[PDB]
Design an enzyme around this catalytic site. Sequence first.
Site, PDB file in Angstrom:
ATOM      1  N   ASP A 116      47.086  51.700  32.727  1.00 45.54           N
ATOM      2  CA  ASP A 116      48.027  50.933  33.602  1.00 45.54           C
ATOM      3  C   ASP A 116      49.199  52.418  33.378  1.00 45.54           C
ATOM      4  O   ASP A 116      50.194  52.746  32.515  1.00 45.54           O
ATOM      5  CB  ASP A 116      48.752  50.251  32.537  1.00 45.54           C
ATOM      6  CG  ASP A 116      48.950  48.385  33.424  1.00 45.54           C
ATOM      7  OD1 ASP A 116      49.108  49.216  34.879  1.00 45.54           O
ATOM      8  OD2 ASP A 116      48.573  47.812  33.314  1.00 45.54           O
ATOM      9  N   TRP A 126      42.416  38.925  37.661  1.00 47.38           N
ATOM     10  CA  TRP A 126      42.525  38.310  36.081  1.00 47.38           C
ATOM     11  C   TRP A 126      42.533  39.131  34.827  1.00 47.38           C
ATOM     12  O   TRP A 126      42.168  39.330  34.222  1.00 47.38           O
ATOM     13  CB  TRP A 126      41.139  37.276  35.557  1.00 47.38           C
ATOM     14  CG  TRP A 126      41.322  36.932  34.975  1.00 47.38           C
ATOM     15  CD1 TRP A 126      42.201  36.247  33.891  1.00 47.38           C
ATOM     16  CD2 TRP A 126      39.868  35.518  34.836  1.00 47.38           C
ATOM     17  NE1 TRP A 126      41.742  35.179  33.134  1.00 47.38           N
ATOM     18  CE2 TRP A 126      40.123  35.205  33.221  1.00 47.38           C
ATOM     19  CE3 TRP A 126      39.298  35.074  35.250  1.00 47.38           C
ATOM     20  CZ2 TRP A 126      39.912  33.489  32.799  1.00 47.38           C
ATOM     21  CZ3 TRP A 126      38.333  34.157  34.994  1.00 47.38           C
ATOM     22  CH2 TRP A 126      38.683  33.499  33.973  1.00 47.38           C
ATOM     23  N   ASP A 127      44.792  39.568  34.578  1.00 44.06           N
ATOM     24  CA  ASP A 127      44.759  39.733  33.937  1.00 44.06           C
ATOM     25  C   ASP A 127      44.711  39.237  32.594  1.00 44.06           C
ATOM     26  O   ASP A 127      44.410  37.805  32.685  1.00 44.06           O
ATOM     27  CB  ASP A 127      46.679  40.279  33.579  1.00 44.06           C
ATOM     28  CG  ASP A 127      47.297  41.151  33.574  1.00 44.06           C
ATOM     29  OD1 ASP A 127      46.874  41.845  32.817  1.00 44.06           O
ATOM     30  OD2 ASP A 127      48.353  41.992  33.833  1.00 44.06           O
TER      31      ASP A 127
END
Lengths: 754, 754, 183, 191
Positions: free
Chosen positions: A549, A478-479
Amino acid sequence: AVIFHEKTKEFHIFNREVSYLMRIMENGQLENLYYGKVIRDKEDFGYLHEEAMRSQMSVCIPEPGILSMQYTRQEYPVYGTGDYRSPALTVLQENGSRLVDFSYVSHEIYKGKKGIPPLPSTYAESEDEAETLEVTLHDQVTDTDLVLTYTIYEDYPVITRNARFEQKGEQKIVLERAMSASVEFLDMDYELVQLSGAWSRERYVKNRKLEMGIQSVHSLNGTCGGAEHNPFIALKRPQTTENQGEVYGFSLVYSGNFLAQAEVSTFDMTRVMLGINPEDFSWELNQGESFQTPEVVMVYSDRGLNKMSQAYHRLYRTRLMRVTWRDKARPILLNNWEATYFDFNEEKILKIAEKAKEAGVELFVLDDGWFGARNDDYRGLGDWYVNLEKLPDGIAGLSRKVEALGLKFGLWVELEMVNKDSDLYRAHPDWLIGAPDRFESHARHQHVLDFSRKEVVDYIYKMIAKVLRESSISYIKWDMNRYMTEPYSRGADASQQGKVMHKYILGVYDLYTRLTTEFPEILFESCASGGARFDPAMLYFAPQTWTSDDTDASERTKIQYGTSYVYPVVSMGSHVSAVPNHQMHRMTPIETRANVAYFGTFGYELDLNLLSEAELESVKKQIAFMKEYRELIQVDGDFYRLLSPFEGNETAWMVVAQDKSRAVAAFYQRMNKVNASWIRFKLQGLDAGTLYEVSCDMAPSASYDESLAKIYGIVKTYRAYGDELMQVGIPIDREDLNKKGGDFASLLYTLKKV
Amino acid sequence: AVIFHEKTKEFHIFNREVSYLMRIMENGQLENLYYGKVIRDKEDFGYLHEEAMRSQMSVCIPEPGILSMQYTRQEYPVYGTGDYRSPALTVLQENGSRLVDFSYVSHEIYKGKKGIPPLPSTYAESEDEAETLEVTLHDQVTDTDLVLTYTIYEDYPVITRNARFEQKGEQKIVLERAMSASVEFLDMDYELVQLSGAWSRERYVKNRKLEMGIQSVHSLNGTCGGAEHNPFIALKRPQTTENQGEVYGFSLVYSGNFLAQAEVSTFDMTRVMLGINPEDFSWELNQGESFQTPEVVMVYSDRGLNKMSQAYHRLYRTRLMRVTWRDKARPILLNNWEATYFDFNEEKILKIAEKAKEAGVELFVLDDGWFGARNDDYRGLGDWYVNLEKLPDGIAGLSRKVEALGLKFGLWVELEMVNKDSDLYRAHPDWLIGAPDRFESHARHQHVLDFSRKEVVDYIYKMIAKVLRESSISYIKWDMNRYMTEPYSRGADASQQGKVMHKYILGVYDLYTRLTTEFPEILFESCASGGARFDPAMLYFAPQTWTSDDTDASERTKIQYGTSYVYPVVSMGSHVSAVPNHQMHRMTPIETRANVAYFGTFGYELDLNLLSEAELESVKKQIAFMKEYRELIQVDGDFYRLLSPFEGNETAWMVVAQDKSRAVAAFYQRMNKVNASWIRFKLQGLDAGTLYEVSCDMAPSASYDESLAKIYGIVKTYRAYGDELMQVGIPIDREDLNKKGGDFASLLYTLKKV
Amino acid sequence: GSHVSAVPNHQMHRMTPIETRANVAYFGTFGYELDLNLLSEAELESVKKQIAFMKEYRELIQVDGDFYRLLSPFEGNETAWMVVAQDKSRAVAAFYQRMNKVNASWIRFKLQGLDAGTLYEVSCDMAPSASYDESLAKIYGIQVKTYRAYGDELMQVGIPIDREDLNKKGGDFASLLYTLKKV
Amino acid sequence: ELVQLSGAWSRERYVKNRKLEMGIQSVHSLNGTCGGAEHNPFIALKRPQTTENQGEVYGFSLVYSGNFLAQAEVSTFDMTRVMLGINPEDFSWELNQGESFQTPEVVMVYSDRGLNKMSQAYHRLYRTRLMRVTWRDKARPILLNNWEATYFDFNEEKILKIAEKAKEAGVELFVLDDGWFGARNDDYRGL
């Protein structure tokens, strides 16, 4: 244990490690006496409270007595009655006054824990694990009541606190500020430890020295806690080391706006508070309505920072996560984001999943680009159905084929946001969050979906529940990459704004609860662009998250060292990636990336068919090692930090089994040094009197000109005791880590019982 | 000078010393570009605004453009449009939302300065001495307009800032936070300086290092700024000392609750804000109503802290004090507080004043006890007639007798507080400031009155002008010994209950204005319990303030060192007290007491007929010295700080004439050292090439024993140049200040041009 | 070796209460570089009471007992040390001040070297000196210490110090002495 | 970090801490007839985070009451060397056949629980294994000295009225301090 001492009106809460004392003043207030290491109790402790006659001091009791709130240590303070320090409560009434007074009424003691149903918290599996004390206070003028709840865990030095408000009269009140905890100390010889960063550089450890005034951290991001500050605070003496000292730690179980504040007065007194941000908070209470604040967990250690971190690790692994994954090892997977961000198709995917079966991968996760018409970052979001121009067989056929290859399947979803060109915006665009006649800001061409209302979230669920039912999915990610702007709601009265920034979090919690209840067989992966929502309240709902990231062995050690202060290793997610980096464009040895990725969850973000045959054989050994040692690394073991990357050029940590019969240690270096000193390596958690054997691998990898080391003139098993490995250490040769690449280099050592 | 550069939409404000640059961005906001030392002006400066794309960044303009409020420097910000720092404005509307957008409309430039009538502020004599710029911004949703005012002072590096709100619509708005100024810097390599203390120890200098988050100082005392923190904030480089480095200073002209905040983000951007505390503040605005904020005075120096302090001294002496006492020397007075407490008649007052007439005293002050039944601290406050039992002659007769003796007269008043035992409370108890059905706190057996209500101000103004009209008074001392608590006003509505504190401050300002205007020949002394409300605001009405209530030979060398940072020497009061102190009970030599009391307003609090004849000669010499040198010390002269007591053991300052023709320097020691080093005393402000002669007085104290000195075998004048005195210094013999008393010793030096 | 001299000492020219001089001279070889025909009558009786204390406690102070340093005079304003017996059954503690502080904070005197689980009795005599202005305290409103505790409550929580008992001991170079007995 | 004791007359043995850096850091004595009040022959090396109650520390002391040198050298490869001994300033000892030379003793103590433990070890060792057996575990008597009571000005009748008074108080030992020998009325003659 909890004792009352009814003749003296006190409260002593203790276990084998800590003590907490309080007593009832003569004006119906609870005030702190001691918080620290365990002490024996006696009948009277009255001498610990002292009264003086200062100037400009206003007393809150009748004339003969002397007692002021400015020179006292009180739990849950308030402003406007003789205390001129930042308050913790603020109530507005119909006559316009902000003046409250709560006095003691009754108390109750029981065994176990409760659930604070609207919000997550820690639980107890037995009646012999925890004990709970509840104190009720009453405000007679406005006819309201306040409940303070304390819980003590045995077998750990862990205390949890929360507060609840009940309204009983025909009047309506407004809450404009409601903190969850408040702790006071009589001195100021401390230091504040916090974790601060930004995108692609998260949770760097920072230290400040306390001074008269206010020092605080906060978050106003609305939709998440943010990558700027993390809701964790530590207070430590200036002479505290990783393995000696005295430190207090406070954590908040919440993933919204937060405020953490430490105020030092001019009489050397410290006050620490944590809670929701009062920036845009206004909760209206009517007859028969209640309000519950988040939970605060505090831990005290007197043997350094490692002990406190270990208390957090054990508590969050065993008493916060669901019993489905409490004693389980995560799988090894492969993602296609870096390999193929947007341009892909079933055929280009059936060759990546085919190659990643000989190596040993066991999960394949698709990413953005499979729904509506998402070919770029400006279209298709909110249309959660299969695109038939890229996957003709659909998601069901692709999942069937992948499972036929012998792998598992996983998907990507972002169930919170919408683009302008989607069908959801054309059908009815009045479900967005915003204000009339106001401009609508755009982050990444997308806007937030107003979950403050129940009808929208419902629709969302159905549109996706099917995708799970038709196909055979086992993993979802779920981003969420956008902050909340202009918090206004169309479906609310003029006296209902100010609840939206809390109702949004409540709605997302409800959606998580629904999805997890229906499908208790799916692992969930939380993602806020890579680490903007690492709050534990999420660890209660999703067992693991994406740490960052960055995916750079050079920058991931820096981030994980800071992260490991409070969050367990299992939670952190790590991956190995290509060498021409995308975020930093730096190049590293392939054995360094693998070494950094071991301490967490293993995974790959590569194209395994583009690598050369002399490195597709290192990937086969990496996977074998990881699936041999993940049982020790993840679920059963203790984490020790040995060297700090924030002060120096080297980093080093290790993990040890609970019985001290097996351990693995890692040593990383940043920049190559020429003609330098001898370097040793001491370990911390072992057993003196044991006869471990030490094993290391010194294989010279590619990028080594042994034909030049000749011009300049330039067995690994040895058995030693824990004594020598602690006081003396392991000799490191600077010529050895020059064959490992030189610039960024690493070493792993494995210890065995006999 | 103010220039527009219409083609580029900029604003450049400069004089011979400083420059300020700003511009209008493409969404109608104001942006800061540069603030600091003076630079020459070209037509284009637009390349100084740099913007780049980042993640998690929301823009506020249409899609093609890129402009984020998180990564830009802006003046007077707001929350809810893309900025996640602390805002400077909060407006609540009828729909319930808090969202405002102010866009530029027009501007005006003129010569001179306005008055902002409701509040005190600096003035500009004539014109051509200052220049003013006004910018108007408008919001269309609420039809409310904002005016920002910038003023540049020529001949000084002084810039003043203020703001104003006007409502033009048919609706009503609620301001919940309002700041006066907001300044931003591109880095965070700074240090924060503050003055913090308590009763009997005020304004100690404290340095802090800037770290990510919030560093702030506030005040919540209600009736005053308090002794805990002072409204002054300075940012300095870490390598800045008294005579080199760069420093910015900010001061607020206001005597109520305040907040001063420095917020550092993760991108190394610093934001400084000062204004009113928004804790219990909520101002309602209807059609045709306006709100005005206090003024912020800000100064820049590039040659150390001395230059900044001198700029403050000159500005506050020439442009803030009234013209009547702008160029005069303060008289020498005798007080009677510490001589007698509550125990005096008409007869003891005459004897204590008859003796202090041959010495050279020219003013006599009578303290608390002359009114009502004020025989103790429990009763009598509130009614302002003459206690006929103590003074059958009365105030008029006492004043006439004192004038006949050749002195002047002064009285003591506290026109804000009342006792339960006074006639004012028995007549009508509804004038107290408090809430119904709440307990009333008491500080020193006294309570506060609702200055907010004018019916009360009208009643207080009478019964006081009567006393000042019947008799011949020349000096009044105003004391306040109670803070504000439970701020509720019985004479108000459900709304407007959040305006009590600001209205109280405005009411006390109005009473000062009346009293000063109708008696333009009386000198006023402001004493809020001994230095709790010291600020320029109070300097606008009362030319001098009582610095502290400690009166120690020492202690006052650390309260005046810290105080001298922003306030001129003529403001601080300084008297001589009894040899065994009443606060610390230590014993000091009289010479040190005199040498500390010189650098202020000289005075006495002794009983001159209980001293010895060897002491009545010293007092006469002290009076002669002070009335010879007070013109240089007070009216015309620059204050230099030489050696700091906060870092070390010695204190040293000096004062120099404006044409470098005369100066006096002092040296103070705290502890006595045995077998120590040689000590040199370097001066700082002089003229190289001049040939001053240096003179000192060295007469042994009466406690020095000589027969013991011969067992252990143990006026001056000389000529020197300025550079020899500035690089080399005066060699002090450590046996010279062993004849001055030993423990707390002091030396004076006088320099002359010839 | 330490001695007790006349109050206006010949080296620094400083006045110090006699009991502070006695308290500092106890930890060493007690002595007197003084003349007792010059002392007053109210101060000669105070000298005989110091010799009895020294003759009673010198065996614990000198021949058997560990020495712990608690507070450092090179880092702050106060000094503090103590001496503990070898079986942890008797102890003496001393606290010293350099400069008087007005309107200051609280003080918690934390000890070391004792053993948790043993019930100790703490005693101190806070008798006023001969240079105390009582009426001055009266007009300011600010106008047999034996108590029992445990070993851990004394090292982890301190002994509360009342600053008004440091102001009637002279104020400037005041000192306090505590005695602990295992009973 | 290097810990040393430095002072002067009427102010002896103040504690001073230094941080090591590449080079030499030393303290010596050159007074000849004694070690001097300036520096004391004792050196400590402690970790930067060491308190009275936690941390490790090494202490070196030298049993010698003359000239001394104590040195700590740090090389450019982070290697530390500590030496103590006699000062070689004017030292030159000639040895022939059948002759020997002996250096003073150096005592070194290591502790890992702060500084109180090291100090206590030194106190116990010096009390029990250095001082003479006859006065090893006795209590020193109470004495009265008359240097700051009379200086050089006294007589026989002046002191026998002091001694009689300091017998009612509880004193048990009297000491003459100077002037007793012939021709001693100032600090010029008689010694």
